[PDB]
Structures are given as C-alpha cells and as structure tokens.
Design a binder for this molecule. Structure first.
Ligand SMILES: CC(C)CC(=O)C(=O)OP(=O)(O)OC[C@H]1O[C@@H](n2cnc3c(N)ncnc32)[C@H](O)[C@@H]1O
Ligand SMILES: CC(C)CC(=O)C(=O)OP(=O)(O)OC[C@H]1O[C@@H](n2cnc3c(N)ncnc32)[C@H](O)[C@@H]1O
Lengths: 545, 531
C-alpha cells in the first residue's frame, strides 16, 4: 500500500538536548563563518559561539527572562540571531523564529502578523539588531501599546559570560516558529533532534561537510535542516544574508567556490534564478567540484529547472547528481524525505511522468509529450523514524501510484500550534498521523507531491478543453476565491484584438458546455518568447517579493 | 464621532436565566405551533413545552448527561429540537446548535464540519429525530469511529417528567453554536443571550401579543435567539415552519403569514427576492397580510431594490409599507444588534443613503441616485440598548461619522469566546472590550450602515485597499465609462468601454494595467482587465 516507513531511528544515540549539541560542537575546531561581502567575512567558532551565547545570556537574565519565557526574534544579522538563539537555548528561553518585517513604518500585513504572534505570546521581549532596534521600537506607536520591550544583541556581546546553563529536558519546548494569521509551531528538543538525526543518517552528513546557507534562519530548513544539523555534526557552516543572494543570485556560485562548500540548499526558485544567468555563467569561472549535496525543497521541484541547472553548471565542476529534492514542513521539523536519484545525464531518473487522464485513478506511466502528460519530481524515501501514508477523502489508506492526502507519522512532529487546540485537532488525526494538507502519491516507498488541498477548485481537464478552441495555443488555469471562479490564462495563436476577443468568448462558452459550468465562472486572460517556464517565473516573483 | 451607544439596558429587570424564561412563559396559555402542511399543524403550549422538556430530561439524565456536558443536535423536526433545547436548559446541558447534514451517505463538506465540532466537543451524545437517527448512526462508518453515541427525542416523550431542574447561573454556558474553512464553536451564556433578547425586545417593542412566524433554521442565531428565545421571553405566540418547506415553495411564506395572522417574521435578503421572482403567481393569488407589522431582513446585504420591490408587490395583499426592518448581527454577539425602522414603500430613499462613488475613501458626500457614479446602501439602524458600535481604521483608531472602516461591537451580548481556540479569540477580542466583526461600514447619525467585508479587500505589497479606491484610478483611464474590481487569490478589474470596438477595448484595457500598476506600484501581471 501507499505506506512507507523510513526504518528504525535510534534517537538514544548522541545528544538529547540542544545544549549537548553545542557542548560537543564547541570541542571541535569548526564553527560558523558569516559572509559580509566578496572580500570580508566574520568567523565564530563553535567554541566562540558558546561563549558569545553565554554573554548574551547574561543580558537576557538581566532583563528578567526566566526559563520557559518566549523571546521574539527580529533579526537582520545572522551572527546576532545565531548567537541569540543559543543564548536562549542556554537559558531555557524559547525563541520565536519569525522574519523581520519589510518595513516598520506602516501597519502592513507583515506587521499585523507580528502583532498577532506577539500578543499570543503575552508580550514577549523582542530581541533584534542594532540595525533594526530603531525600526522595531516604532511598533510601540503602530500597535498603540505601552507593553513593547526591545533589546539589541550586540550590546550584550560585551558582557561577562553566564556559565549557568538551565538544565533542559528533551521534551522541553526549544523554540516557536511561525507558519491568514500565522500559527505558532511549538517544538521540543526531541522532535527537532529526531529530524536532525534522521536527516544526518539519510544524507550521511559528517563533521567534514562544509555548509553554505543563505536562506533565512526563520525558515525551518534554515534553522533545523542546516544550522542545527551542522552544529550536531559539528561541521563547518557558512552563513550568508538572504538579501545578498536575491540581489545577485550568482553570489551563490561565488560562495560555493570561495568556501569549497560541500552542501547547500534553496527552494526551486533559486535554481531557476541562477538559470536566468546563463549568459554571464558561460563567461564566468567557478570551481564547484567540492559540492556534493544541493538540497532542493520548500516548493514544487521542477524537473526542467534542476536539469538545466545541472547542465549550465557542469562546465564549472558541478557533478550531475548533487541535486537532492526534499519535502518537509515546519510542523515536522523540516525535511522528512530526500531523493538521491536526480542525474544530469538521465532526465528520467528520479522523475515520474504519467498520463493526464490517469491523475484521478491509478497513475499510468507515459513518455513525456508536448501535451497530455505531467512530470513530477520524486522526493524520495522517508528519513529514518518517519512513516508516510497517502489516504483518500475518507482518510482510508490508498495503494501506491494513487494521488491522495499525504500524512506523516514520526518523532519529529511539533507539540502543536501554540494556544490553538482547535487547529491542533485539524492536523493531529487518530493514531499519530499528522495531516499535511499536501497531495501526492507513494511509488516504491518514495513520496511524490502533486498539489495541495487548498489548491482544489481538475486543472489538466480545463486546460485540454480550453485548447480545443481554435484561437488557443496553450492555457493555464488557477482557481480563485460572490463566486468560486477559475481564471483561464491563454496564449492566442495571434495577438490581434478581434482574434483575442473571439478566442476568449469560445473559451468561456466551450468550457461552460463541455464541463456544465456557468459561462460566468470562466474568465479568459490573454498573455515575444520567454525561456523560463511559467510555473517557475511565479516561484521567482513570490520568493523575491 | 463614529461611535453609537444604544442607551442603557436594565438587565437586572426580568428573567436572568432561560429556566426563568420558560417558567414565566408557561404561565401564559400561548406557545408554539409547528406547521405540518396547509391543512395540518401541531400545537405545543409553553406549559406543554416545559412538561415535554422534563420528560426528555429524564431520558438525557438516564443517558448519564450531567450539568455542563455538551449535547450535539441533529434535527429535521422543529418540535423535537425545541423540546431538546429546553430539556438541556432544565438539565444544565449545553446544546450544540448545528444543522443536520444534507446526507450522511457520503463524506461531504457538511459532514466534515460536523466531525470537527463533534471531535472538538470530545464526542458528545448526538441528539436527533427517530426519523433521522438511522442516517446519523451512519457517521460511525463514515467517520470510522466507535465512540459515536446517538439518541432520539421522540421515544423520550413517553417518560416521566423530571421536575428537578439544575440551578443555573447567568454566566453558565447556555449553548454552543457553529459559525457559518472549518466552523468555530461560539459559546454563549444565559447572560449574553438574554442581554440580546432584552435589547431586541426593547428596540422593536415586542410584546406578549405578537404572533411570530419563522421558517429559518433554529441552528441559525437569528432563529434561536432573535425569534425563538425572544418569543419565549415575551410569552407570545410563535409559529414554526420547516426551512425546506419554504425553499420548496416560497409562497408558503405568504400562506403562513395569512393563515396565522403573523405580526412578525424574518429572513435574509434572498428570501424577499425569492418572493419577488413569483410576481406572476402573486398577481393571481389572494392573501390578507394586514396583521404583519415587522419583517426583519438580515444575515446578508439588504438590497434596496429587493425590499422596495417586495413592498410594492405585496401591498395589494395588505402588507403595510413600513414593515420591513433591516438588521445586522452575528452569532458571536448572539444575533441582531441593530434594527432599522426607516424603510418605507412610498419613499425608496428613506432608510437608504446614497453617495458619490468617489467620496468613499474619505468623508462620504451625499448625492441623488444616478445610473452611474453613485452607490446606495441600506441603513441598518441604531444599536439596540446596551450595544456600542464604532468604526476604526487599519490602526484601530476611532473615525468620524460618514467614514468607512472596520466595524467593532461592545456590549453585554458578546460570546464567552470560540470554544477551545485561544488564538481565534485574541483575533476578535480587541483591546478596550471591542469585538472585531470583520465587516466594513460607517456610522451616520448613530445608525450603522454596512458596505462590505474585510475578506473582500485587495491586499498587494502587504497593504489593504477597498474595491472603490482601485475603481477610481481605473475610471481615470480614457475610454473607461465605469468599473468594478473584485480581489483574486492564486485584481480582476471589470469595466465598461465608452465604445464597443476590439482595438478601442484592448488599449483601454492596456492603459488600465499601466495606470494602476504605476499608481499602486503593482506588477502589471497582477492586473486582469475584463470588459
Ligand atoms: C526543509 C524543506 C525541505 C521544506 C520545509 O520544511 C518547509 O518548507 O517548511 P514550511 O513549513 O515552511 O512549508 C511547508 C510546505 O511547503 C511545501 N513544500 C515543501 N517542500 C515541498 C516540495 N519539495 N514540493 C512541494 N511542496 C513543498 C509543503 O506544502 C509543505 O506542507
Ligand atoms: C440579523 C441576525 C439574525 C443575523 C446574524 O446574526 C447572522 O447572520 O449570523 P452569522 O453569525 O451567522 O453571520 C454574521 C455575518 O452575517 C453578515 N451579516 C449579518 N447581517 C448582515 C446585514 N444586515 N448586512 C450585511 N451583512 C450581514 C455579517 O458579515 C456578519 O458578520
């Protein structure tokens, strides 16, 4: 059946709290390196991190923080945030990992979400940078509150070390992380370390790895899949600012080369962004021969994006098997599946193609064609300790090669959303099954995501019918919440105004007839040549936004 | 400012718990009449209601229910549901008011929402009809659970009367009701529900002589509170019909009003428009609607066209032209909190306010209705006694009158909160004791007028915008007569061209994307121009 177990995970081996992770890491000579620019870097050994964290701990306790208290992180500096995180670990304080707002001068969406979590956590101390404390302090006027408390981390780095680490238990909450209003994922040392240990075993991570990450530390893959995995293995890890990558994506290449990185990760959009620079890549020089692990996860992994990425960077020494698709969620401590089958020389390896007609039934393999076939990137087997299953509308187990609702069982699951019993019921189903909200199938024990529940009105059938209209070259439907309406994008064979209005009328009326919808339910939108796929360009727009 | 207090409401006056309400009602000879069909009915005096509720109480207590335990309601029959509700009041049990599922054979949205509530309430006994109990028991297979418990009301009607009522306190929970995503479980007390009853009775001057007619579901807050509980509190005669019977043949509404000489009734705006569809059948029928004095219209946007048409069409049948009363409320505030007494058949501008469509972002400017360039809204009236309404901007700052903003409510009718959801309770329970409704509107002369919902606003670059604000920028484009914009989630701007020609329409469509993308700093890809 569509139920895959990753095998036994011995979580008794190794550290049991994050304090023990930092202690064992501080015994190595490895640590962190924070990139400032192409020439300058700031180093912080794991031994220095421990002392720095103890210094910050002195200031936090001076502000009255007691073990169990939450701490609201609002950082632009990786150095200050990493240090602040471990100070909290030492003090038994619970960090709330959430990105800083794009601006603090007006009551925008990001600022509203921060207020919600801040109020849900009963007005916790906000910890931030010197470069942000002025902005963050403005929230006192935006929120019309006298309960705002802010403090910068850098001033604390000049304090005496507080060597009295609060004794933590594996089930103690280790941090909150934010996902409408965001929910407050509460994790323990046990759930995080279980993902770390599972991730290390599946990928064979070691203390000799060299890690490069520019993704936000407020993203679960930034904090757990990399930062904590790196400290747990005690390997060398290089941190870059997210802003610096999206400003100049080719810096990713420079960084992998300059530090001889062996592993890194990004969502699929970053790979597509690099592919947009083929001209300047074909006139550049990088040594990427040390890179062994480029994890691709957090959103849909597009086969043609990763293949082009491997092709473009092959002359620069990137082996064709470094890209590892992965899937995970903050609620399950980051990635729980990894695919080791993507190969530059085999576009079909680790990629599954099926007939569009069979999406609602037993999937029927096919050879990729211009139309009528869909290609999905396999995301691999569960890591040790994780069980995945695929279920139908009634939560009944499905067989393999059947698209259904993905559910996860294992030791990496959050304690739950903070202060929301009702939301915890929706996701925590009977017998330990966490409901992801994602759609996919299992094939040879390997998970493949195909969509989301919120992404439900079949869009392959709507597009096929739209393409029978003579004026339509190709089509793309997205659903859109007075009416539940589907917006039908199309390329006309001819971008002439009369021709477009004819095709638009036929699209509306031909879809209304063939599928028994109201013509009012279909909106036709007309859309040179672009090389980047449409699904890939929208990934880039939402990411850099 | 845009803040209106409805006046002081003496809550210490009158019954303080629903037990007291039924006891007083039972002293009258009035009660309920359940409509079976045109030629049949079942009657249940308030005294008989108390006795029937005492018998059901014997069955519920026989099932082990204790004071404070919830009870899941799944009813096709109003008589059984009303009796169950009061049996739970006598026993201190907390009914969970939710409509029956359209079908228990398949796993539809309704059944999922029931499981969520049922699970949230920790598997309460489900109380249902002997008619429906067969399908309800099917949830055991559909939900794949062995903890389901179901019982029928009717068999319990043969048991002895348990006259030992649990002593209730005003702040005890009196019932749960599900919101209309997954629904939330609104929890109310006798105090909050009775505060709304008392304010509503005072605003409308309801009395023991009213004759009430209601076909709306008792799982709707206006069905249980605004009418049923108001009617028991006033001790008046109330007629109950089944909701399906009305939808089957809407004109039965007129039949019932005529047959029972009803003085008050209610429905959402659609029901009035349903009747308007039947102009032909109404022109060849005969009703005496002269006793009707109060037709509440609420739960949806009140369309001036629909109500004024409705009034002209039933006037030959004796419907007075002032009977329709727009109203707004929410289950979280236990039903209506404003009533408008200004609608009139002979003056289609009374109780209605029209403005220049350009004055909507700042101080509204009154106007004379026009074919284009003006919008008109139905006033929903002053707060009932005890309620305070205010309008606020995106920073929760008070606004002046004639300004559109977020509507907030304060008063004694507010729920305890959403059951087992601290987070959602924070979102709606704002500082200074204000409840965030999620609706938009303005105050004018102390009267509330709604103009939209927050879920309808367009969010771009994390900033929020009204539909009309975008429309005014779109209007500036040459060749755009009028426009309407409706937010999209993956900006659908619908416009009328000055001249209907392909190239003329295509280029006005291009200047709408360029002019708005420029003025709002948005990606042209995000602007969809539809003619
Ligand atoms: C550490 C990373 C591997 C991922 C992660 O852990 C994360 O992304 O955490 P996040 O909570 O932020 O969001 C979770 C939601 O991202 C979606 N998602 C993640 N990976 C995906 C993939 N490979 N393909 C398609 N969709 C994917 C999914 O829908 C999921 O439920
Ligand atoms: C009159 C009461 C019995 C209605 C009621 O109490 C109810 O309708 O209960 P409900 O909680 O189910 O729904 C609440 C949501 O209905 C919307 N709503 C209600 N009345 C409205 C009106 N007059 N005009 C426009 N919208 C209205 C509003 O958005 C509100 O927040």
């Amino acid at each position: 059946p569509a139920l895959s177990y990753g095998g036994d995970l011995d979580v008794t081996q190794g550290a049991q709290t994050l304090q023990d992770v930092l202690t064992e890491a501080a015994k190595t000579t490895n640590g962190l390196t924070y990139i400032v620019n192409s020439k300058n870097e700031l180093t912080q050994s794991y031994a220095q991190l421990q002392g720095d964290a103890e210094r910050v701990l002195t200031g936090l306790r001076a502000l009255g923080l007691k073990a169990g208290d939450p701490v609201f992180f609002q950082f632009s500096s990786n150095h200050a945030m990493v240090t602040a995180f471990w100070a909290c670990v030492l003090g038994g304080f619970v960090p709330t990992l959430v990105s800083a707002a794009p601006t603090y001068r007006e009551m925008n969406a990001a600022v509203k979400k921060l207020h919600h979590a801040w109020k849900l956590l009963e007005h916790p101390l906000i910890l931030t940078d010197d470069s942000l404390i002025e902005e963050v302090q403005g929230l006192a006027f935006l929120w019309h509150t006298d309960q705002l408390r802010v403090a910068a981390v850098e001033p604390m780095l000049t304090l005496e070390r507080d060597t009295a680490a609060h004794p933590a238990a594996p089930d103690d909450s280790v941090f909150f992380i934010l996902t409408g209003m965001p929910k407050c994922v509460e994790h323990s040392h046990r759930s995080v370390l279980a993902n770390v240990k599972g991730t290390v075993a599946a990928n064979q991570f070691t203390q000799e790895d060299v890690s490069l990450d520019w993704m936000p530390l407020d993203h679960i893959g930034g904090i757990v899949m990399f930062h904590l995995v790196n400290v747990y293995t005690g390997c060398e890890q290089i941190r870059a600012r997210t802003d610096d990558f999206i400003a100049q994506p080719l810096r990713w290449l420079d960084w992998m080369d300059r530090y001889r990185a062996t592993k890194t990760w990004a969502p699929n959009f970053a790979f597509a962004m690099i592919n947009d620079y083929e001209k300047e890549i074909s006139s550049g020089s990088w040594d990427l021969s040390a890179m062994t692990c480029m994890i691709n996860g957090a959103e849909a992994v597009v086969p043609k994006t990763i293949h082009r990425f491997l092709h473009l960077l092959a002359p620069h020494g990137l082996k064709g098997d470094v890209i590892r698709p992965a899937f995970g969620m903050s609620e399950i401590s980051s990635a729980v599946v990894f695919s080791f089958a993507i190969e530059r020389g085999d576009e079909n390896s680790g990629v599954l193609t099926f007939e569009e007609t069979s999406l609602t039934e037993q999937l029927r393999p096919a050879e990729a064609r211009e139309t009528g076939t869909v290609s999905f990137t396999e995301l691999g087997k569960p890591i040790p300790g994780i069980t995945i299953r695929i279920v139908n509308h009634q939560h009944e187990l499905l067989p393999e090669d059947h698209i259904g609702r993905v559910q996860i069982k294992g030791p990496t699951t959050m304690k739950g959303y903070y202060r929301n019993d009702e939301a915890n019921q929706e996701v925590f189903q009977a017998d330990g099954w966490f409901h992801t909200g994602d759609l996919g199938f299992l094939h040879e024990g390997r998970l493949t995501l195909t969509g989301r529940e919120k992404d439900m009105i079949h869009n392959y059938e709507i597009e096929a019918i739209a393409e029978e209209v003579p004026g339509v070259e190709t089509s793309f439907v997205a659903a859109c919440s007075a009416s539940d309406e589907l917006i039908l994008f199309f390329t006309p064979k001819l971008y002439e105004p009369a021709y477009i209005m004819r095709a638009s009328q036929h699209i509306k009326s031909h879809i209304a007839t063939k599928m028994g919808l109201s013509a009012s339910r279909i909106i036709p939108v007309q859309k040179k040549i672009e090389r980047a796929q449409l699904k890939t360009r929208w990934q880039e727009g939402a990411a850099a936004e």
